Write a protein that binds this ligand. Structure first.
Ligand SMILES: [Mg+2]
Length: 184
């Protein structure tokens, strides 16, 4: 019915506390969303990308705390745009777990400063929409302490961005995610 994927910033700019904080957020979403009708996938990124768990793997073993805890920080650059592309092409993939007719929800968590990425958001956002991927953005660290970084959130996130962008310690994001699921 609804396939939700997480793309988390593992870049060296994300501070440790905040990496732990991100992980925290993901589990909380996964917890409150006691499937029966929802699968999750997740990937972290640097200049490199890691698939920590796929819809299949989440389906085989749907234990939150047991899928997230392992995940350690990659560090390095921030290839968010390529992260976006790779998430729709690899995670929202049927040979990896994705379903048909199900809604696609991409949750991207980051500080909002892409760096070193060859791709600009204008190279992946269109394909996101063509593929129907709804995007939410959870900004962490210095995400909101900068105008250039705030605009990065708006760029990534689906419209209206006010309904798809929250600071990680704003617990409306969870509330809004539960809503997004009753308004399909
Ligand atoms: Mg994680």
């Amino acid at each position: 019915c609804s396939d939700i994927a997480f793309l988390i910033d593992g870049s060296g700019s994300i501070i440790p506390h905040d990496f732990r904080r991100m992980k925290e957020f993901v589990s909380t979403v996964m917890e409150q969303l006691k499937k029966s009708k929802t699968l999750f996938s997740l990937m972290q990124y640097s200049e490199e990308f890691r698939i920590h768990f796929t819809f299949k793997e989440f389906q085989n073993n749907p234990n939150p705390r047991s899928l997230v805890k392992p995940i350690t920080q990659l560090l390095g650059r921030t290839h968010t745009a390529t992260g976006i592309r790779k998430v729709v092409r690899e995670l929202f993939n049927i040979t990896n777990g994705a379903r048909k007719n199900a809604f696609k929800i991409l949750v991207v968590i980051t500080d909002g400063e892409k760096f070193g990425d060859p791709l600009g958001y204008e190279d992946v956002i269109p394909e996101a929409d063509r593929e129907g991927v709804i995007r939410y953005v959870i900004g962490v660290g210095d995400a909101f302490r900068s105008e250039k970084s705030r605009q990065e959130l708006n760029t990534i996130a689906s419209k209206p961005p006010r309904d798809h962008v929250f600071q990680v310690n704003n617990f409306e994001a969870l509330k809004t995610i539960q809503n997004q699921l009753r308004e399909c």
